[PDB]
Amino acid sequence: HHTDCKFIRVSGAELVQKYIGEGSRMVRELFVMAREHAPSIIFMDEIDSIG
Amino acid sequence: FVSNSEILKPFEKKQEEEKKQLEEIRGNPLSIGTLEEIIDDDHAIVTSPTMPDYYVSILSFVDKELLEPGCSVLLHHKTMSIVGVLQDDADPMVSVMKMDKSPTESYSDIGGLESQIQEIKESVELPLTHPELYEEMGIKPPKGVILYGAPGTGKTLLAKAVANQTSATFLRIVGSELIQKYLGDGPRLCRQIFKVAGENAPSIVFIDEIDAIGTKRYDSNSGGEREIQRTMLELLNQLDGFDDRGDVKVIMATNKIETLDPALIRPGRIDRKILFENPDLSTKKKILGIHTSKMNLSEDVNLETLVTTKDDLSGADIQAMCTEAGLLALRERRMQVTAEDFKQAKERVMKNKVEENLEGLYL
Amino acid sequence: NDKVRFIKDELRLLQEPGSYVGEVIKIVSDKKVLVKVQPEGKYIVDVAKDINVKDLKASQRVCLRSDSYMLHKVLENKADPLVSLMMVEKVPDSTYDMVGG
Amino acid sequence: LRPGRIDRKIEFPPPSVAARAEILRIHSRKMNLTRGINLRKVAEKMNGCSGADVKGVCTEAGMYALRERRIHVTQEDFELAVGKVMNKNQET
Amino acid sequence: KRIQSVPLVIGQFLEPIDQNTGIVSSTTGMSYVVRILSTLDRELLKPSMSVALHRHSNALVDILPPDSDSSISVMGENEKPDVTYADVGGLDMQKQEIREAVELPLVQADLYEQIGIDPPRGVLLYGPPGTGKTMLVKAVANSTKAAFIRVNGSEFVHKYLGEGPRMVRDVFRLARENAPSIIFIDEVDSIATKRFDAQTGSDREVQRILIELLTQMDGFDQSTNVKVIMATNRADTLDPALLRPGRLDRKIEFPSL
Amino acid sequence: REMFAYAKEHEPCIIFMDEVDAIGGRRFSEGTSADREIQRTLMELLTQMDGFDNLGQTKIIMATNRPDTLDPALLRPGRLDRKVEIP
Numbered sequence: 001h002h003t004d005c006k007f008i009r010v011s012g013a014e015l016v017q018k019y020i021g022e023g024s025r026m027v028r029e030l031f032v033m034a035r036e037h038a039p040s041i042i043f044m045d046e047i048d049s050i051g
Numbered sequence: 052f053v054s055n056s057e058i059l060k061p062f063e064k065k066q067e068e069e070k071k072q073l074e075e076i077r078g079n080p081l082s083i084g085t086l087e088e089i090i091d092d093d094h095a096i097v098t099s100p101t102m103p104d105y106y107v108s109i110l111s112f113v114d115k116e117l118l119e120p121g122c123s124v125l126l127h128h129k130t131m132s133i134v135g136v137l138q139d140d141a142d143p144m145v146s147v148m149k150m151d152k153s154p155t156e157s158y159s160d161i162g163g164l165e166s167q168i169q170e171i172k173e174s175v176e177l178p179l180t181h182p183e184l185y186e187e188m189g190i191k192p193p194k195g196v197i198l199y200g201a202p203g204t205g206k207t208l209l210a211k212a213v214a215n216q217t218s219a220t221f222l223r224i225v226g227s228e229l230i231q232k233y234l235g236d237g238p239r240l241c242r243q244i245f246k247v248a249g250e251n252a253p254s255i256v257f258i259d260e261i262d263a264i265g266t267k268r269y270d271s272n273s274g275g276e277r278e279i280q281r282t283m284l285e286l287l288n289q290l291d292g293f294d295d296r297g298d299v300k301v302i303m304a305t306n307k308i309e310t311l312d313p314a315l316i317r318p319g320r321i322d323r324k325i326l327f328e329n330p331d332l333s334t335k336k337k338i339l340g341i342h343t344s345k346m347n348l349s350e351d352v353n354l355e356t357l358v359t360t361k362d363d364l365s366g367a368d369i370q371a372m373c374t375e376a377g378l379l380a381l382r383e384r385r386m387q388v389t390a391e392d393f394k395q396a397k398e399r400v401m402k403n404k405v406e407e408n409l410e411g412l413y414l
Numbered sequence: 415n416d417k418v419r420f421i422k423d424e425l426r427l428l429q430e431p432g433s434y435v436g437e438v439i440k441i442v443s444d445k446k447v448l449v450k451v452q453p454e455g456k457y458i459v460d461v462a463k464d465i466n467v468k469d470l471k472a473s474q475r476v477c478l479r480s481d482s483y484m485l486h487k488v489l490e491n492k493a494d495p496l497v498s499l500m501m502v503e504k505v506p507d508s509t510y511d512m513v514g515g
Numbered sequence: 516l517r518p519g520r521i522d523r524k525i526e527f528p529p530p531s532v533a534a535r536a537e538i539l540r541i542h543s544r545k546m547n548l549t550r551g552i553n554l555r556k557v558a559e560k561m562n563g564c565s566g567a568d569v570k571g572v573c574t575e576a577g578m579y580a581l582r583e584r585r586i587h588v589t590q591e592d593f594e595l596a597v598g599k600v601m602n603k604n605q606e607t
Numbered sequence: 608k609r610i611q612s613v614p615l616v617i618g619q620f621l622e623p624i625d626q627n628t629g630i631v632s633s634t635t636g637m638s639y640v641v642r643i644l645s646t647l648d649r650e651l652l653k654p655s656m657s658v659a660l661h662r663h664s665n666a667l668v669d670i671l672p673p674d675s676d677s678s679i680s681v682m683g684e685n686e687k688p689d690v691t692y693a694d695v696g697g698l699d700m701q702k703q704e705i706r707e708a709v710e711l712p713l714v715q716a717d718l719y720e721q722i723g724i725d726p727p728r729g730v731l732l733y734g735p736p737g738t739g740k741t742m743l744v745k746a747v748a749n750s751t752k753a754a755f756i757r758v759n760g761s762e763f764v765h766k767y768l769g770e771g772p773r774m775v776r777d778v779f780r781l782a783r784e785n786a787p788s789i790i791f792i793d794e795v796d797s798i799a800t801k802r803f804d805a806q807t808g809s810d811r812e813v814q815r816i817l818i819e820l821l822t823q824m825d826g827f828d829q830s831t832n833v834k835v836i837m838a839t840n841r842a843d844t845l846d847p848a849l850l851r852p853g854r855l856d857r858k859i860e861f862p863s864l
Numbered sequence: 865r866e867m868f869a870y871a872k873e874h875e876p877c878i879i880f881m882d883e884v885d886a887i888g889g890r891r892f893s894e895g896t897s898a899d900r901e902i903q904r905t906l907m908e909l910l911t912q913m914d915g916f917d918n919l920g921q922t923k924i925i926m927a928t929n930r931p932d933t934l935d936p937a938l939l940r941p942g943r944l945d946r947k948v949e950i951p
Binding site: 686687689735736737738741745757759760761764793794796797798800801802803806807809813840841843844 | 890892893894895896898900903904907908910911914915916918936937938939940941942943
């Protein structure tokens with residue numbers, strides 16, 4: 001908020017899909033979303049098993 | 052006058068008559084679809100996104116070489132005839148591909164590795180920059196190199212300087228991204244990697260940090276041990292069974308390559324095995340001056356003093372102290388970093404940041 | 415009177431086949447825009463004479479005419495969330511005063 | 516763990532009585548309260564609670580007020596809210 | 608306005624564009640942009656309001672009353688009550704939490720505004736399957752005696768592509784007309800799963816079924832007059848994104864052993 | 865839903881099940897190559913015997929080669945009340 005950015009999470013579970021040419025694109029697709037918009041500050045979600 | 056009547060006059064007359072036909076040839080909607088197969092009779096089958104099926108005749112504005120199974124062409128509204136082929140612009144498929152043009156790197160920052168640089172430069176940069184050496188001699192350059200050594204030697208910057216001098220396509224394939232959740236997508240990914248690299252230029256193929264199949268570690272992606280071979284052997288068949296004249300250069304590097312299947316390494320195609328170790332006190336003096344070249348240092352700070360303190364450190368550990376020393380002075384906001392900041396920075400890196408294990412030691 | 419004349423002339427507009435819905439992907443120098451209809455397939459149509467291809471770009475919701483199969487005008491742009499799941503939050507409400515200790 | 520990837524490692528200490536005292540008043544600032552309570556006394560009864568447990572006491576503070584059909588939250592609700600949250604942490 | 612008078616295609620309004628002009632979605636799956644009839648008005652309809660379209664031109668003709676058609680339209684009471692809340696014991700611990708998050712806000716909505724607590728837009732249920740989750744919902748329907756909607760989780764799937772997402776929005780529209788409305792979905796884990804969301808190249812997406820669940824619930828419930836109750840098997844099956852702020856925060860698990 | 869639709873028409877009806885090793889199991893969703901059709905198939909068999917629709921004249925006879933391949937939720941009371949073993 002203080003840096004005036006766009007908060008975007010990362011869910012590692014849905015980053016792997018199956019398409020034609022887009023199969024492995026979805027993993028790193030979040031990199032492009034941080035290109036067109038510079039104020040990214042990417043955050044990571046779904047770390048590990050908390051029980 | 053004389054030539055303009057036999058050149059410009061017949062050309063402008065045919066172009067105006069051709070544009071008048073484009074209204075009857077190319078309609079308003081201009082439906083498209085996916086081309087399946089072509090026949091020597093100038094008849095093909097095209098499937099629109101609504102999944103219909105038709106059989107029509109191949110019209111002008113296309114040739115037999117431009118038609119390939121699995122491409123997209125242009126159709127007609129009422130007659131559904133093929134108008135022509137539509138080329139695919141703005142990258143073949145993916146826009147986030149590591150392909151770039153002339154990145155920023157030089158040989159001054161990688162200095163100290165010249166003993167290991169001479170081997171990789173002759174097998175990669177030399178045939179691309181000076182092809183007349185290998186072609187006129189008759190020898191065939193290797194199709195790739197492989198790197199091995201202790202972590203922290205900066206093996207990433209070794210191949211980064213090649214992309215700038217060669218001024219060609221530079222691709223990167225993460226070793227952890229080789230596998231896929233859905234079974235069967237592993238070889239489908241690797242098949243598209245060499246497909247794009249083979250169409251445009253010899254370029255470069257660089258694979259770094261391969262954890263694939265090593266000691267499991269991925270329980271969210273299940274291959275059933277059968278996807279292990281199908282994904283790995285796909286990389287092997289493209290480096291052996293695939294017909295190539297030596298243009299494709301595939302580079303593989305990670306912390307430990309001994310755990311990988313040596314059959315996947317495909318010996319005899321890669322003639323360069325480069326080893327990396329920890330630099331001595333003479334090499335660290337040159338490496339320390341690289342990171343401190345753009346840094347403002349005080350008068351009491353000596354480069355030979357910090358190198359003597361450094362013990363059992365790699366190239367990445369030297370840059371860590373220069374970065375940490377800049378952050379310590381950043382809190383106090385000093386233009387020139389004093390000597391008291393380097394003393395506190397070198398102690399915190401080798402302690403909290405770098406955890407030195409025993410491994411093989413026996414003092 | 416003009417309100418009465420416009421209502422009596424609405425029958426000609428009601429009998430008009432209407433227009434489709436599509437999205438702009440790419441353009442060419444022939445003034446032919448690629449329109450992707452969601453229920454139907456893709457169709458390459460011609461832009462209107464009152465507009466050009468300078469104001470058209472990728473991922474733009476427009477209006478595709480039916481009878482003449484041509485572009486009419488631009489409706490709206492593409493929404494911020496894309497692909498499967500895209501979380502877009504700009505300027506949150508969390509500050510330093512909200513975090514104690 | 517080696518440098519070149521993560522340049523800063525911040526260790527988060529667990530919340531304490533003095534730490535949860537300022538956290539309890541922030542989450543409860545968005546609801547109705549009573550000046551007759553104590554900020555550090557409620558957090559003193561809680562031990563080892565996380566940030567979600569402090570918000571749980573604040574969230575459940577208004578739940579018990581709905582049973583009495585009152586627009587205020589007195590010390591009676593905080594004593595019942597802590598006892599419910601402490602049982603959830605000790606369960607499973 | 609009386610020109611048509613004949614069989615019409617059932618449309619659905621989407622977004623306003625121009626004066627006397629709007630985009631509509633026909634039940635045939637093909638969306639068209641037509642002009643609004645002069646005798647109608649953009650303020651007389653709703654963003655989700657279902658309308659009628661011409662047979663051929665698919666132009667807007669008449670605005671249907673604010674009620675939709677999915678299955679039976681679910682008036683909600685036909686011979687429904689059998690047992691009462693007193694016939695099921697031991698759930699009083701979890702029954703009090705549901706009555707306060709369901710029956711309480713439907714009666715007095717000003718209690719939450721005074722205490723400054725945002726009431727949840729619905730209530731989920733967890734624990735071992737095949738035991739409860741049907742006992743407490745049945746007691747609320749008999750005690751409240753108001754609008755109740757019971758739709759199976761896999762019932763939203765229709766043999767036609769575009770019919771699936773259209774039937775999802777039609778359920779929330781019927782709950783907005785009657786203020787004491789309770790939406791119940793039994794075994795919601797069929798259309799809502801952890802991952803699994805991408806159907807790849809089978810048919811279209813099928814994610815649109817889940818997208819309409821997040822779109823309709825987040826845009827509605829401004830007055831918190833509509834609650835949604837869902838049942839499932841376990842927590843790991845459902846989409847974990849459903850527990851985030853801004854949407855349903857309620858979590859209730861059936862005690863085991 | 866078509867088979868149970870005849871329960872309200874003809875009251876003396878009993879629907880059988882022949883050797884179900886597939887749609888009677890639990891098999892929650894992780895991967896499994898888009899099983900939603902079989903996943904929702906299980907949800908329909910657990911619907912008519914659960915929801916407020918009352919019949920009482922329709923009996924469900926389900927045969928299987930082993931209880932371990934059946935959904936534990938289906939084995940819970942309220943759907944299959946009596947388990948008749950044929951050793």
